[PDB]
Structure formats: C-alpha cells, structure tokens
Design a protein around this ligand. Structure first.
Ligand SMILES: CCCCOc1ccc(CSC(=N)N)cc1Cl
Ligand SMILES: CCCCOc1ccc(CSC(=N)N)cc1Cl
Lengths: 395, 389
C-alpha cells in the first residue's frame, strides 16, 4: 500500500452549495476586482454573470466600475426549457481566489435580462461553463474561460470536481457555512478520493460526452440495447441536479427500482420526482432501495468499468413542508428527451477528473460521498465488454 | 357463402402487418388494428407516441370501465405496458354487432409500434391460454362469439402486392380480407384442405414433411415442430427452428446456385436487386410443407413460391430495380408460419371444428410457369410422433 498525498490544499474545499441549487466557487472580475459567486457547470460553455439588478441577486458585475472592461458590442441570448438569460458580451480580467494564482483576460456575458435562471437563496450570481467551444453561444468563436486560462498560463489542461452532498437538508445559514466540495484547477488531489481512478473516453469535445455500455439495478442487468443508454448522447453535467435518463431507459429503470423496493409502496408523485417522502428521524430504509451501476467504456479495447451509486445519492434530501424532525427526500432520477445526464446527484458519489489534455474523464469513489455501514459507492474494473462503439448514437 | 361487407377490409403488407378498422368506446373512437393470430390480447395505444397520430382516450368514453390492473407484455421483437379495462367494441367492415370486450390501454412501449404502419393497436385472435396476464382475461373473439350469433370461425386472405408500396400507395391498396364468422368462396381457388389445431393456445399445427423443389429435407419430422409450429399473421417471415433453418438454407442455396448472394442476404438483413422485371424467379425453388390431415394416416401439402418467401422492398435509391429481402429466418421458439406464407393462401381458422384450412389464394403472387398449391392426400404414418412434447 501507500498513502496518497493531497497536493492542492489551496483549492481543496473551495466550493459551496448543494445538488438542488448548484455548487459554486468564488471568482473576481474587473479592476479593481469585483467578487462574485459562480455556479460550476460542466454542462455549458459560457462564463456569464448578473450585470444588472435582480430580485434574487445581492450583487452583480458593474462594468462601468472596471477600468479593464472591454465591450465586444455584441449581444447573446441563451434559452433553456428551464431557464433563459440575455446578455451583452465583453472581456475583462478574471481570477479565482481559491484557485491558481493567476489572472487572465476572458470573455464575460453580462446578463442584463433573465427568466427562471437565478435561484432565490442559491448565493451565486453567475455561471462558469466548463465545457467546450462547440456549444458556446452565440457560436464557437467565443472562447470559453478554461480555454483562455490554459492558453494564457501554465495551468495544465485539466480540472477535477468533488461535489459534496451533506446527506441531509441544509438551511440558508448552514449551507453558507458548509463545505460543498472542491474544484481543483490544473490537477488531481489524492486526498479527495479512495481506491483507484478509472477513465472513460470523452467521445466528442462539445459537452463532456461519454458512452454507457451496461446498466444494473442491484446487480440485475437492465438488458436494453446499450444504444438506448446514450440516445441521443450521455453527458456529465454538474449544472443539472438529477440523473436524467432517456424516456425508454427511465421507464425500465423506474420499473426495476420499484420492484427492488417493493416492500414499501410510494405514490406516483414520488417516482415523478415531484413530491417528497418522509420517514421518522433516522429510520430511512436505505436497505430496501437498490444500488445503481453504470458501466462506462474504458480506455483499453474491449474493456469497461463500472461506477455504483447508492440511494444516498439518488434520493435528494429536502426539508419537510412542516420542518418536522422527519428525514425526507425526493427521487432524483427523471426522464430526458435529450439523452442521459449524469448530474450533481451522481457526481456527489465520486471524484470526477476532467482530463481535457488526454480527452478522458476519470471516476473514483469520493471521500465525501454519503453512505451507511453496510454499503458504499464504488468504481470497479475491468470487465470484458465487446462492440462498445455500437453503444454510441449517431444522428 | 359470400360476405361482401367484409371482403377487402384489410390494408398493410407483410413487413409492417395487416390491419382492420375497429372502433372503441362511446362515442366510437376509430383505430386501425393489427390482425394477429399469434397472440390473444386486444391492446391499443392509449397515450401519445411518436409513431401514433391517434390513440384510445379513455376519459372520452362513457362506457369505459377500469379493471384497476396493469399488464406487461415483453416480446423479443417488441414490448408494451398497459392498463386493463373494458369498453364497447365494433368492427365497421365486419359483423353488424357491438360487444363489450377487454382492452389493454398501452401507456408505455419499446419497439412495438412501427413507423408508418398506420395501425395503433393489436387484435390477438389466439386462445385465452396465452392471454396476458393470464387466461382469465377473455380474448376479443371469445367475447364476440359468446355475446352474439357470429359463428365461431374467421378466415384470412392476406394479399401481398408483389412489389413495394410507398406511403401513399399502401394506404390506398387493398391488403386482403378478414371474414368474421364465415368463408367467402371468391377469395380462393381449388379445394380447402384442413389440418387439426393440435392444442388451443397458439394456432398450433403439425408439419410432417418438408420439400425444397421436390427434394425431401429428410429430417426427423419432430425437428420441424420443435418446440411447436404455429400460424402467426403477426410475424412477417416464415421462421424455422435453428437446425431446420440451417438445412433449408443449404438446400435453397444449392437450388439457386447459378447466382451467388452475400451472407447478409441469407441472414434476411440485406436486399438483393435485379434490373426492372428481370427477377430470376425460376432459379429459386418452391417450398412444400406437408401438414397432418384430419383423416388417419393422411396428409396434404401447401407449396409456396419465391414470390412468397422473397419480400419486396424499396431500394435505397428508390431506383426502378426490383429488390427483395429473404423472408425465411431462424427461430428458437419453433416454426412460425408468418405473413410471408399466409400471403399464398386463404386460411380458415375453424375454431368450432378445431382445425385450420388452407386453399390457394385468389391474390397470391406468381408467374406464368408456377403457382402456389394446396394438394392431397398423401399416405403418412406416425404423424403424431412429429409433435413435440
Ligand atoms: C442545479 C442548478 C440549476 C441552475 O440552472 C441552470 C444551470 C445550468 C444551465 C446550463 S445548461 C446545463 N448545465 N444543462 C442552465 C440552467 Cl437554467
Ligand atoms: C409484422 C408486424 C410486427 C408487429 O410487432 C408485433 C406483432 C405481434 C406481436 C405478438 S407475438 C406474435 N404475433 N408472435 C408482437 C409484436 Cl412486437
């Protein structure tokens, strides 16, 4: 054996937040530096910050107060089914206090209008899209922040994320004082995980796309054509709360999870991820819920590995509408019409390494994943898997 | 016997299925329903689906009755999830009656519906024994016979066009006839020969001999019915048990050896094309299946042509070439006499007399040199040993 050292102490524990409202890191923009909390999102590629008064913002980017602000004289509109924002493009000097000790000039979308984008009480005033230029708006000519960081400094083309769910509800005061995880920029900190790191290839450089080759519910093979698991794509997205699955896969998964937890009957609203379920304090029956394993393509031909999450990950802690002492949760798995989305729910069980340089994503059991005395999340391999390329979807 | 009101009431093709129009609920909701002698459930899409432009809306039917029970039906080639209930059902171009029957409202599915097939449900015409969830769910035809004076029998004339039919063409073409409660003599030529329905679950029969251009496949006849042989309008191909399939393909390849085709063709996966009008029908052999007759130690045979087992398909370039796919495939669940085979004959499902009749179809495709046939009798011993137990 050999104890693994943590070499990026300055960046360890630099995140705050939770799966339902997002995890954020502190950043500064402009001269003099204007401090803002920014949502870490591996599912988008724009660096955008509130730049005008808004009911849910306690502060925002004031371009007129920055001597280094540069106007790009271009607007941008970014709509999502669950949120939309409009902004004005420009550039300025940006830094990450608890990150690399560098300052770079990057693109910034000054949000002037928005709808259902900012979340009341989330404590963040902007978003940091860490994905590739291909999906940046208005187009791929707007260089993403991380690309600027790597091109302008000696920071390695890699970052890693340890999102830490608490395992219980956090009130407004508590979530502000709690450590929500770590975003290590330019490296891998070995104190954040246990076991070994297993890597899956980044299929294409736009979203952080990966390929799932097998799915199990408590060891039972869902037995669907693996192509279904990646229809029309599978991505790792810290900006989405739930583990989202293609309609057909969701239907098969929920049926299997229902069967595995059949000793307890839950209302349809629960399985729809709409209503919470509660149990008397400390009595949550974790053991009746199954573990979920997702097998991912490995880097070696015909080789795969699996990541296994517990209900402690897919059941999201929520406060009872009566703030009672009951322990309540919402089912954090839902259907998608845009492919599989490995959201915050899933990432909370692992330390995820976005190895841009080697076009691969690594997974390892997180040192802060919630579990019980009987089961733990896992990352195991290798397994012999054939024709994994056929699992990928093509329009 | 002539049932003009039911003649030509079917549409579709072997590859996507043949369907009949039906109505469910009050007021009547019209839906196109796949005619399937290979299953026993009446199930209809009851929720939006990309392949459906209409579906059963239970909340709009005053006669809808909820049975408060679900049913999951998974097949290797398709699966559907449903909610059971009953309602009033009718067949516009069928007997002038309305009956209350069980209906599985399909709410979820996986590769069940077919894009462009034009049908939104399935009518399982087989027996209760294979009804899902169990045999307590009375099949539609059983309800029909019990509630009306309609004779316990129906006949099917599936009509293959012999060439590809595009979207608009297949909607205007007559795909055949489903005569409910009788036999229409205008749909066939020659005599009807009957084979016993071995057991009342699937429409099971017993094949006693197989020939490829007159040459005996020479296998133990039990191999032909392992683990059963059924007449299934819901399956496209003629499917044969693994061992029988391998022997048949070897023989068909040998007979058509003057022309070589890629393995993909024989796997029924890829098409083969010929310049317009030049399909070499004559190099392909006829296939004869001998069936147990109703008289002791007697059998008869049905013979199909390549016009039946080579299924017309459109070329990727929609050229003027005449293309087809090999419609004979391997099975691990017994012999399946699918649409391919039924297109050559008028098939009578004589439920009342527990037998299935075959006669040359008035709409089977052929050429000037050969025709499908139903001939007999032949002296065949120990035919009961051909059945699998
Ligand atoms: C859980 C935090 C909710 C914040 O809401 C977000 C977060 C990210 C994105 C970018 S698109 C994407 N990451 N799939 C859009 C919206 Cl509306
Ligand atoms: C050619 C049309 C294909 C439609 O697909 C069907 C048709 C019938 C059945 C019932 S099982 C059976 N008839 N052997 C199941 C499926 Cl997936």
């Amino acid at each position: 054996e050999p104890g693994r050292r943590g070499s990026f102490v300055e960046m360890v524990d630099n995140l705050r937040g939770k799966s339902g409202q997002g995890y954020y890191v502190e950043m500064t923009v402009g001269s003099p530096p204007q401090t803002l909390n920014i949502l870490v999102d591996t599912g988008s590629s724009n660096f955008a910050v509130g730049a005008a008064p808004h009911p849910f913002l306690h502060r925002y980017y004031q371009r007129q107060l920055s001597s280094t602000y540069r106007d790009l004289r271009k607007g941008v509109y970014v709509p999502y089914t669950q949120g939309k924002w409009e902004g004005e493009l420009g550039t300025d000097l940006v830094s990450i206090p608890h990150g690399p000790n560098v300052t770079v000039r990057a693109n910034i979308a000054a949000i002037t209008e928005s709808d259902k984008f900012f979340i009341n009480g989330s404590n963040w005033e902007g978003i940091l899209g860490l994905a590739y230029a291909e999906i940046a708006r208005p187009d791929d000519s707007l260089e993403p922040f991380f690309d600027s960081l790597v091109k302008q400094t000696h920071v390695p083309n890699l970052f890693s994320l340890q999102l830490c769910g608490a395992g219980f509800p956090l009130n407004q005061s508590e979530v502000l004082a709690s450590v929500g995880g770590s975003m290590i920029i330019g490296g891998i900190d070995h104190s954040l995980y246990t076991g070994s790191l297993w890597y899956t290839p980044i299929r294409r450089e736009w979203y952080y796309e990966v390929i799932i080759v097998r799915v199990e519910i408590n060891g039972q093979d869902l037995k669907m054509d693996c192509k279904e698991y990646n229809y029309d794509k599978s991505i790792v997205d810290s900006g989405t709360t739930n583990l989202r699955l293609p309609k057909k896969v969701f239907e098969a998964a929920v049926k299997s999870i229902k069967a595995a937890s059949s000793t307890e009957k839950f209302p349809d609203g629960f399985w729809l991820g709409e209503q919470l379920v509660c149990w008397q304090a400390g009595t949550t029956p974790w053991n009746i819920f199954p573990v979920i394993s997702l097998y991912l393509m490995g880097e070696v031909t015909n080789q795969s590995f699996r990541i296994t999450i517990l209900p402690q990950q897919y059941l999201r802690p929520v406060e009872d509408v009566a703030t009672s002492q009951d322990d309540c949760y919402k089912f954090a798995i839902s259907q998608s019409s845009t492919g599989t989305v490995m959201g915050a729910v899933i990432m909370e069980g692992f330390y995820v390494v976005f190895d841009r340089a080697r076009k691969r994503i690594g997974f390892a059991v997180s040192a802060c994943h919630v579990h019980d005395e009987f089961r733990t999340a896992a990352v195991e391999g290798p397994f012999v898997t054939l024709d994994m390329e056929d699992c990928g979807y093509n329009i």
